[model samples]
Target chain A: PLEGYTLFSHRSAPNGFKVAIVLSELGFHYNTIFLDFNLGEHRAPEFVSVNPNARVPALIDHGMDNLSIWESGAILLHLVNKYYKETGNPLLWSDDLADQSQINAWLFFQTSGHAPMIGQALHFRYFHSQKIASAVERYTDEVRRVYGVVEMALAERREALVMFDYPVWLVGDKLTIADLAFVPWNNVVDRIGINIKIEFPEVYKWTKHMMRRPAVIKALRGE
Target chain B: FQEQPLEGYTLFSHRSAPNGFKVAIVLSELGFHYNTIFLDFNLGEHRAPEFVSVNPNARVPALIDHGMDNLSIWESGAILLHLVNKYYKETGNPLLWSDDLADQSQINAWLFFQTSGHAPMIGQALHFRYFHSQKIASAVERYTDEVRRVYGVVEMALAERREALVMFDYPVWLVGDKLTIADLAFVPWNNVVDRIGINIKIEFPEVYKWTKHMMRRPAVIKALRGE
Candidate 1:
């Protein structure tokens, strides 16, 4: 039970979907409060106090006495550490330090690096930022570059994995919280019409397989 | 590991250690030599013409291999991974790999934790400390609170079992009974704790010991030294 836990989720936010997926998979109950993006519900004073950044998927772990976690990635890790993981995997458990560190490195890379870069890419391609050529190219190219690294990792690991390895799933084989953590951001690549398959077949395959899981599909719909 | 040779290396460094110091520590640990060139943060050196020629972002620390037709690696994490992978490939070091899948992912998770959790806190800390003193009340609480919360997460991770962030593995500093890139990324920031105004003792014991252990490394000391 997320007893007294409330998630401020937005309809279109991947971060919201991430929470839904985890909460659903863990079979936890949570109160969902929807905010209107068009009406600037997020910018409302009520929302601001809950999350100063005004970003959605802010959780008041009232069980922790109204402790508010603002950032999505932080929320993801925090929830999993506190509640989920009967398996005892610490955010995508690995067999050794190297792979574990690498997974963390990439998660940070995605959170700090890709999430913002891709957010800009989406903005330029779909929002008013389109007129800014420099912004468009800069962010889009960064996405492409990060795509290149994943592609290389896919190629390098495929031969060794029992199955074809693509997108280096946090740990080598099993899915951990790391893989779950990245889904929202990667899914947005498609929402923005980046065409994962044509540009990045391996990443495309990896992403598709991840979404195919029942837990992911159900959560993406925010049930 | 003796230091790697820097005979053909060119480095691009920003004032910060976010990922720049990862390469610096790796170089020191590998016992390598390389040239250090500073990018003028105030002058936007990273975004200048010369730097863009090396890295698209004009960010630091970027590395170039003179022998490989001056091929450059732009991102800090990528550079650190490339260096360690190239140097340790022959030895099949466990520092770079755990004994199994679970151990490996744990290390990656913490590394992710640094970039995701600590980096933002540190950024806010830096901004609060150096940029906007007038905004002290909000800024100090903003960064310090986040820093403490992140430490809470770390404490919880270690408490999950006897294991530190990674389950069942030795401390991140010990991989295959030897230090790996985990130490490379963590040590420098622990030194920058004052900038964030965090108390290691009351707030974070596991992290405190982890920091002190890393401080004992000679390479860590050398990496912190001003060029």
Candidate 2:
């Protein structure tokens, strides 16, 4: 029943894609605008109206009172809370309150912990015109350390939640929005040359499962 | 209710850190009682495996709710949400959260923004300014500017809210026209911005007044002082 949804993001940016995956997963349609960072399109005046923070993905849900929201994690909260139950697949969320609480834990961790640290790592690695070894090493170590947190959680899940080839999830036996929230950043590792396959086998397995999701595939590739 | 201690909750913390106080402030505001496991960063205690078992992130502000099947929650924002969302009714502290979905969306968005956007910038700003040994001049300037920019974001929101709504007397807040965990989340990291030379008193008046008002609360005073 949701309509006139427009999502703004850079095509390559993980934050934007994170919201895109969730929208597709819940069987909702959205107009996607990939802002050109090279052109400083994200900082444009009209774009800032959508998100004062001037970051993507910002959502204008013209259907839902034109409720404007920024921050990918918050948008997921809005989408999953309002629409997940009506969707064909109800498994992306749970009816259990405690499960939902734990899911919030993972979501916050992804947004606050890995996202910022890895973003710093990327800037030092690729964007900074002047390279500082100390800055680079600090963020790199943080990125690896953050991955270690995920790797540990997945390894624990693998050992205990044994099933017929089901991939490890952050919470419960089935995949939830919490697990999907990490997709964009986890993919960033591959682009920037952190071989999770070699170092974090469990995380690698988890990401492989996410890549196989039709929703994630669609969001990553589609307009 | 504030007099009687609640049971089955333990907070693993480093008393000196800004994040650890965030949980303490929430618990205090909600009138919840708990035990404290004060961690020592001088000994690298947070990084130890035992602590990491409680917090896979291996960071401060991990909470163990023994009442809830010994549930271990990490990440400061999650702990704040868990405490408020699960027990706000039983505890009768309804001001910190909203039952409204729209408000929840905005509150959670601000909380996430605080951590992702605000905390990292100020944390790194301090790192380059004071903590890091080899001071790259641009790095210091870069993060410092980011911190100021973050403060400006809050300033604009608070100012706009002030203009839009006529609160007879109460101060403007981050969401729902009242105080909540969202404002509290930004409190800890902001205490030190003055040292880095962002003058909240002059440059960011709205944020300055907002922080001052919240800091004066009885619960917040104890949490900030770690009493």
Candidate 3:
């Protein structure tokens, strides 16, 4: 499986690692290259060939049609669909359209609502050349607002996840890409300022539980 | 193919916002009938307990599909995908999506790009340009520049499709020859790029042509007009 796998990555970017978590969970091997955003490594023509959008965490799945995939969400769905059978787990995804309906909306929500809003906070707070306290505060508050939605999810899904023996998750009885997609962004909340332990104890407990997964441990360590 | 019992659902929508149109267009294209409750965000109607209960994120275009066991759905992307897959499966009309594995995955990627990148980036460009707290020109410029950059990705991809057109077989749509939720998802935001001072017609002619093709669809035209 390692023979034809290459994952284009960024050292600290969470989106790419989201794919790695899926890959690690499904038992695939791939070479990882960390592109230096400072040197314009990501904008190079060859790299752009891999991801026309030119974002990090694109994958080159040589074994399957040399599928050079972009978008971390796309890559996660693709890999798990192609490999989840080898792992012998139906938990990663479901053939049921109704279940996929919920799973995908949450996946899109993570990318659209959760991640982009937090990215704005970082951009305004740390990366922008000029300081605008209003801008920073605006996005900072958005970070908390976005987190609130997830907090509500745990409250909503607690009863549903309780009927089964698996860990609590966003949808269905087990962990799907929907919940895995949130881990990287969820980890960053404390770094910014909000106290998850106190502000969102249920959410805090959920992430703490996700961190203990053996596959999550492998993916986070880049192993 | 027989149409299923897809009637009697509710779409929590507002005519003006971009996100809600994605769902309305899908419903129109599929000929699915539903009721629309136009949310008044200015009055904070979307923030009310009832609306918030419908969509925990308190956004527009939430749906309660009475057919799907009264499954309440939020996120326009989710609603549209669910509608096409569950209700549209047997109709076999011109599909906005396909059953092919690669096509399905690639379609999902494009849909994510629309929701995650196009909606948010162009949305922020409009926010910074007109609605941000202070007149920080750089922040406005930052997002405005991103508007063109992301649209450029669309233009570039469309160009690849043109080179292979075999005499009137020009496939202007993304993911497949026919229009898809992939292309439909962009219609709302792509139409609004001018709100941020970027002209799609002049700035990105390829993208402009693509959106025009999508806009000319009878269903999309009616959906956009709230007809």
Candidate 4:
């Protein structure tokens, strides 16, 4: 049983990094046990026993006692509830109806639209031995077009991206949880050496600004 | 549209479902009393004019909030969203996690994914498993491949954390953490995966974890058995 949060994570995985980034920003002390996907460490009997789903970034929060809960989103939420905020205020949750609805919308967008479309684009464009050009272009177009939507939304507001306010970070006034949720995708654009300036100027600027934040910096390093 | 939460409601229910189980799940979740009216496809009940009057598509899970006097709703996503709004609105629990714009957007995103990606995959599974005649090898290839690829998207998200579909926090609910209808929407469909014989856990570990977490939820477990 962990005395506190002991996290099992894999380095270099984008999703794993999202959790690490949040933990670092919150300044939570946690131990890391690396799981190697290449060797199927996640599928091992021992690992699967803890998380039947056999995924990374699992946490053992013994704050109140030994209780194991699985799910990436759940763990992040659990962590935020216990650690991130001093008062346990949900970074992503809002009492206002409209604000709350919008936050859920964007979160859904990333999972259903941005992430899936991008994953498809990546697969058809880069992965797979037999490359299908039309398929690749189709999904890539989707990614670009969705980026266009973001750009358009931002342009209308005179902001870089869609959050609650003008570059509002998908919540009210202060930066909330949207930044932590989405900032990772921006780095992919950087790693591929895709020029966000020419390709997506607004997103480029917005993502760059987010990266400049101390919290984001710590997040990127998977601290 | 129903003003009364506990008053009698009507739901166009299904026996073995494509998506109707969503309503059953939510109805169970809310502990709301609903009279389930099954549309017998053999009798062409769905395509009849009477059924179409309530739902243009004549689909199952068309919920009627009787307290509001025959206020009808169509679309599985809409039904789930509406019920969530009506019942859980006070508690601020995310049936769709309507706590903020991004969170709500996230729920919408996942709903779309279920309808588009997950639903298609489930259809493919059904075609091959139950509807054996239509289970052409190429068709199975197409569906299973589609399922695997979509599962890949889920895997990507889950791999980011311990729980697969969880993002904001909380489990057995929402794509992010906190109980949201997103989890409710997906669970019934994941059952479709088992029926379809897709090796999700072996192929997509992240989704595997998520599916398992979803199954173990007290509500989901109870819902599956109709307990």
Most lDDT-accurate candidate: 2
> In candidate 3, residue B56 scores what lDDT?
80
The native-contact fractions of the candidates, in order shown, are 0.10, 0.76, 0.75, 0.01
Worst 10 residues of 4 chain B by lDDT: B165-174
lDDT of 2 by residue, B23-141 (tens): 88898888777777787887887777777777888788888877676677887888888888876567565669987877888898898898889887888887888889797888888
List the candidates' TM-scores in order.
Answer: 0.54, 0.93, 0.92, 0.57
TM-score of chain A of each: 0.83, 0.92, 0.91, 0.79
Docking outcome class, model 2: medium
Where does model 1 exceed 4 Å of error?
A1-4, A84-99, A162-168, A191-193, B1-227
Residue A201 lDDT in model 3?
Answer: 69
Q: Against the unseen true structure, what C-alpha lDDT does each candidate score? A: 0.62, 0.82, 0.80, 0.60
Q: Per-residue lDDT for B126-157 in model 1, tens only?
A: 76577652443544565677777766665554
Worst 10 residues of 1 chain B by lDDT: B167-176
Q: Please state what fraction of the native interface contacts candidate 2 reproduces.
A: 0.76
Here the TM-score of candidate 2's chain B is: 0.91
Q: Give per-residue CA lDDT, model 4, range A57-121, as digits (tens).
A: 56666664544444444454455545424565555455444444344444434444565566656
lDDT by residue (tens digit), candidate 1, A117-221:
676567656674125554456567778777766655565456666543344453556676556766777777776556778988777777777788887887787
Better of 2 and 4 by DockQ: 2
Winner on lDDT (2 vs 3):
2
